[PDB]
């Protein structure tokens, strides 16, 4: 697994990480990418979408398993321990999934990675994100719950 | 002994290694050299030497000790065994001596760089090399058996 921080002012500002098929940055947040070798790469971004295109040599291409449909409840293995559930976003801790650690992936217990967080601050006495998956068929698309600033 | 990889795109693509009087660079391939010492130093490429100039401050001048005459037949230090031939290059194993390592000198057992690889990548079920050297008085000369490419 390949998952960097991005080097901003030479300390840590973001978290880039590589997926299956193509390689992915955060483009949300700006800063220079620790890696050399994504640091002679052209960048791809959409009006929302802030996603760096795959131009990594084959090779070391497609790190991860990307992740199909039907989301179980079950764990989901998370940086800071496992998440479980199914109707959005994990109730995390509170304290926990505050800001500065931009572009962090949440993995299945397979090694699938479920999704990709591009926000979430804060849900209350719990908390849920603001991230991006397949949406039924496929389809890259982003949920935002209110309240939601990246994290 | 000051043997440096040459940095293209953050992996290794050449081998600068620097020598007793002046310092080298194989400037046959490109690439950023890796060391910043030499990172500031104007290039003297000829039409067919492919040498950098020696600009190192004379406190690490003459890294080695170059090679006269009277080639022996006898062992060569060489990065991947000794060498022992006379009439031309050392009937290095199959395998061996293929590409991407360009720029190494096989060295005399007493520590005299006899000669530089400029390619020869194969010469059959042994395989010979193309490298310069003195000539047999002191010059600089090539020789290139047929079917030589940089290795």
Excluded at 7 to 21: E, H
Aim: contains cysteine; proline residues 6%.
């Amino acid at each position: 697994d390949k998952t960097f921080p991005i080097m901003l002012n030479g300390q840590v500002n973001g978290y880039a990480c590589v997926v299956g098929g193509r390689v992915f940055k955060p483009l949300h947040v700006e800063g220079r990418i620790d890696n050399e070798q994504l640091a002679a790469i052209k960048l791809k971004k959409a009006s929302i979408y802030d996603l760096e295109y795959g131009d990594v040599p084959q090779c070391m291409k497609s790190d991860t398993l990307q992740y199909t449909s039907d989301k179980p409840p079950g764990f989901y293995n998370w940086h800071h321990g496992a998440v479980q559930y199914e109707n959005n976003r994990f109730t995390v801790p509170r304290g926990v999934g505050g800001k500065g650690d931009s572009g962090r992936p949440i993995l299945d217990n397979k090694g699938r990675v479920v999704a990709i967080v591009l926000g979430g601050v804060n849900e209350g006495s719990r908390t849920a994100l603001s991230v991006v998956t397949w949406n039924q068929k496929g389809v890259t698309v982003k949920d935002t719950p209110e309240g939601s600033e990246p994290w």
